[PDB]
């Protein structure tokens, strides 16, 4: 069975993000936390087979949490993505820069977008990226 942490404190992108993977039977361990330091200590517990984090969050210490997972370690290579609203070229490339596995537009403006990005995540990084 997956596990999955997600540092992400807005209610309803985590109730959407549950729903998402109900409706397209994506079967896994789902956790969220809503910070850096709850992240951080979610990490030393488990291996994870893939962290989504929102870089928006300043309280997520995305940085911080991104080359803490990629120290020596079980989750030294777990793929990070980032999923945030308005990612800017910038901060793409200063997620990329940090350790990131991949940046996505959460385009929460538009739930349809939303909806099948996170779907987009899930599927690919449970189902077709090889996991252990």
Known sequence: ??????????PDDIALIRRVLDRKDIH???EFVDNGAKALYQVQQAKYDL???????????????MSAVRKPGANQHTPIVILTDNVSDDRAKQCMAAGASSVVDKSSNNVTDFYGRIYAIFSY??????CQ
Do not use: M, Y
């Open 28 to 30: 896994c361990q789902l």
């Open 1 to 10: 069975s997956k596990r999955v942490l997600v540092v992400e404190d807005n």
């Open 125 to 130: 990084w449970l189902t077709v990226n090889h």
């Open 51 to 65: 962290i989504i984090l929102d870089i928006g969050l300043p309280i997520a210490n995305g940085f911080e949490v």
